[PDB]
Design a protein around this nucleic acid. Sequence first.
RNA 1: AGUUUGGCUGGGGCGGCAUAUCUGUUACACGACAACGCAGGUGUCCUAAGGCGAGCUCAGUGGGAACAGAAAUCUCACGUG
Length: 166
Amino acid sequence: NPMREIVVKKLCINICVGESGDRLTRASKVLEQLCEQTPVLSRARLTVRTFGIRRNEKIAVHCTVRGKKAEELLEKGLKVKEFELKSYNFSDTGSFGFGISEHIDLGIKYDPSTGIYGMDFYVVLGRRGERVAHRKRRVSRVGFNHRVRKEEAMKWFEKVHDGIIF
RNA sequence: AGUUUGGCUGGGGCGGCAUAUCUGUUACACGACAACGCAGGUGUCCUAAGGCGAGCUCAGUGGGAACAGAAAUCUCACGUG
Ligand SMILES: [Mg+2]
Ligand SMILES: [Mg+2]
Ligand code: NA
């Protein structure tokens, strides 16, 4: 069927830094730069003495991207990881992710003020017509065979660009 | 000089509060029912923790992502409470 193909729904970038000061402020500037889109902050839940954080205190910053920018951002990440992944990176849901250690490598001019950060990339894949599980009116469940499974995920990956090590 | 120096109570005293009151059970499938019977509360707190409209779904579990681990943040699914 023409609309049984697998497309990329969204790509989510997350930066999980500690503290709630200038480190968070600079990280937000870096993310909104690479994302050309306003990011949002996140607050903790519990209080942990070991991690030195309190409840509802600013910790991380993240954003989500859909469309062409999502596609090209994904390409840059795979280029940094030379289009090479591992077997234990794909979930049975039908998604996968990875992480770069230095934000310089993506092709961003280093600035001596912001510093160097690492980031997380997560990609969600699914067919067309999943809105039935998200619309306000007459919400239902997607069919089982229509759902995306893990085996089809790597096959999609190799099709666009191979290089998976089991 | 005048007067007073609580009560209940398996005698009275010391102890306790069964002295004004709320929930479950004793209580015998309407209602009502005792003991110093059992297990616990009350003399406060809130300009929002009051009023309404809208949006959302909780506890938890499983699969995934640099530092990150049993436990930090992001994502998908299940989830009659
Ligand atoms: Mg009767
Ligand atoms: Mg009765
Ligand atoms: Na007496």
